[PDB]
Amino acid sequence: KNEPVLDTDGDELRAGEQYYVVSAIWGGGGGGLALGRLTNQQCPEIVVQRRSDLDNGIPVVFYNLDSNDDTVRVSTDLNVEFVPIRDRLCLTSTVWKVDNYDTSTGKWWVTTDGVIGNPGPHTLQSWFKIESGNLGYKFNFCPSVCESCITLCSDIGRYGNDGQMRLALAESGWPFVFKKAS
């Protein structure tokens, strides 16, 4: 039983509850996370952070490994899905997922069209951990759903690309806090 993940009201995060994922840095930290697109790619949508502090972005929900635990805890494999307020053009899912390696930038981006549940080698790319910190919570991609799978193991940092703040694997991660969509 790992320590539960807490939101800005000090309440524990619950699976299936909507939360905005906002930058923990108060003062020049940017807003929350949302969806964007690329010049050469409308679908699936990529994960971006808002530049503006005013925009908390799009809420997410968290899915736990077992559907019978309803507490979000540190160091535990999670599915992350954007819950858009309105329907979207793309038919891809809005579930976070580590992309294939981008040879044009050398980065492993966070994109969508992941999958919910069914842990193991088929859904490996859709599993994320939340790790605690001094500044706040930081996302970590290091899935344990497949003990014999070779996997990347790294924090999720933030990195500009063609005018948008994207998420990608990095040595040091970007800190976030969680705000109820209430």
For the CB of residue 148, give the shortest distance to Ca ion in the complex, in Å: 28
Length of the chain: 182
Which part of the chain contacts Ca ion (CB under 5 A), choosing from 13-21, 105-113, 121-129, 148-156? 13-21
Which of 2, 3, 16, 153 lies at the binding interface for Ca ion (CB under 5 A)?
16
**Residue 182 binding partner per list Ca ion, a copy of itself, none, with a CB distance cut-off of 5 to 8 Å that depends on partner kind:** none
Q: Is 40 annotated as a binding residue?
A: yes
Token code pair at residue 146: 């497949």
- When the beta carbons of 15 and 48 are compared against Ca ion, the nearer one is 15
Residue 128: CB partners within 8 Å, gap ≥ 6?
A: 77, 78, 79, 80, 96, 139, 140, 141, 143, 156
Q: How far apart are CA 169 and CA 166, in angstroms?
A: 10
Q: How far apart are CA 146 and CA 122, in angstroms?
A: 9
Q: Among all residues, whose Cβ is closest to Ca ion?
A: 93
Question: Where do contacts with a copy of itself occur on this chain (CB under 8 A)?
Answer: 1-4, 6, 9-10, 12, 22, 25-32, 34-37, 39, 51-58, 69-71, 73, 85-86, 132-135, 158-166, 172, 174-175
Q: How far apart are CA 67 and CA 58, in angstroms?
A: 23
For the CB of residue 85, give the shortest distance to a copy of itself in the complex, in Å: 8
